[PDB]
């Protein structure tokens, strides 16, 4: 199972290794193909979605088209938010993608109550947070 690649979220970094663990029983696989859009929005309470093997061509709303590689996660819907939300992704490549609804993480959490109170606080104070690394991103 998905054990390195839940853990390979940047906010995993601090998890407790039993949450992470706990989350990945009811995991979802699925595969896109070149130029296909694998995130847009329309309705309340969409999924998380992150990278298990390939590449996506990506914009991020404030700033610049990209690329995200293999390990790398997407889907910008806060856990605790109301409404729906903006983002614009394709595929780059045939890629190995997996998924997890945003509610039954929000399950898991009430299982790890410290994990439960440190997303109550990005829950408001992550506004001028914006994307920050704490040292570099290199290995």
Same mark, same amino acid.
């Given at each position: 199972?998905?054990?390195?690649?839940?853990?390979?979220?940047? *906010? &995993?970094?601090?998890?407790?290794?039993? &949450?992470?663990?706990?989350?990945? =029983?009811?995991?979802? +696989?699925? !595969? +896109? #193909?070149? /130029?296909?859009? %694998?995130?847009?929005? /329309? =309705? %309340? /309470?969409?999924?998380?979605? &992150?990278? #298990?093997? /390939?590449? !996506?061509?990506?914009?991020?709303?404030?700033?610049?088209?990209?690329? *995200?590689?293999?390990?790398?996660? +997407?889907?910008?819907?806060? *856990?605790?938010? $109301? @409404?729906?939300? =903006?983002?614009?992704?394709?595929?780059? =490549?045939?890629?190995?993608?997996?998924?997890?609804?945003?509610?039954? +993480?929000?399950?898991?959490?009430?299982?790890?109550?410290?994990?439960?109170?440190? &997303?109550?606080?990005?829950?408001?104070? $992550?506004?001028?947070?914006? @994307?920050?690394?704490?040292?570099?991103?290199?290995?």
């Amino acid at each position: 199972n998905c054990r390195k690649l839940v853990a390979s979220m940047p *906010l &995993f970094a601090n998890a407790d290794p039993n &949450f992470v663990t706990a989350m990945l =029983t009811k995991l979802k +696989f699925e !595969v +896109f #193909q070149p /130029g296909d859009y %694998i995130i847009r929005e /329309g =309705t %309340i /309470g969409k999924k998380m979605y &992150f990278i #298990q093997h /390939g590449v !996506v061509s990506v914009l991020t709303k404030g700033n610049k088209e990209m690329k *995200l590689s293999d390990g790398s996660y +997407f889907g910008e819907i806060c *856990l605790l938010t $109301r @409404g729906r939300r =903006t983002a614009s992704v394709r595929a780059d =490549t045939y890629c190995r993608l997996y998924s997890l609804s945003v509610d039954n +993480f929000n399950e898991v959490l009430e299982e790890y109550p410290m994990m439960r109170r440190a &997303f109550e606080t990005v829950a408001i104070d $992550r506004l001028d947070r914006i @994307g920050k690394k704490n040292s570099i991103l290199l290995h």
